[PDB]
Amino acid sequence: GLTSEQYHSQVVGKIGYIARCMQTIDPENNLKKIREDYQDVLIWAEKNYRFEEILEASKSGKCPNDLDALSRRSLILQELLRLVSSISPFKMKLDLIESQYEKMKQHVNLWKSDYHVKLNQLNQLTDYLKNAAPTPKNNFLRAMTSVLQMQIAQYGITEDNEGINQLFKLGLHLLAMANEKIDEQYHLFKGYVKDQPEESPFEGILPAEDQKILVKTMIDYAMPKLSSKVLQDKLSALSSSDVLTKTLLDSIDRIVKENEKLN
């Protein structure tokens, strides 16, 4: 058990941290159904109280000062902000954010939740890419992670979606795969794009410069197989696309199958 000076210092600190979280999830007071639950702590951030004046108010029982209730409240607001922060370019609807909040508030235990697992998997997948150098594995992971963030911005974390759940399995399997095994990395990424519902998987998800590189890096992988100059020149004609599509992969595969028949 904490000493009284420790215990009340942790209450002052944890009231202060909820204000930092609320100012980060919502700089504008858009999330009004969320703020109306937390207003009973945020009132202590709305005016200066110098640490010491919340410390006296906490000792006096004027503040909420049950560290268990303050911990439960803080974990919900933190696990919401992790989701909104892990989806970097894309944005949720306010009606979706306040739905994720209600589903989290209803949960028995967030640490043991599948929501927390899916967030840890998304951060495991995202933090690797913050320092990653350009190479086929890292380009495939930037593509799949951008698609995954975009789908999570459409459907949230709180319900199973076969696209999201398959794209977690694909992304984490490629992340764990040995960096020397380029044949397996290309095979896995092509196998993903072949199982996408759409003809173009990255359409507005990804920069056209990166989509051009995804076409180019498959042409550069296929071209060393081709013994016929005509098949090399037909493969080279596919480099006219700046969009990665099932048709591009099928065309590279078709030219590779013509080479496998030719030799």
Partner: peptide, 13 residues
């Protein structure tokens, strides 16, 4: 990132 001058801070932060 969201610590600033005036932020309230406690042991283990």
């Amino acid at each position: 990132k969201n610590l600033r001058v005036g932020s309230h801070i406690t042991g283990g932060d």
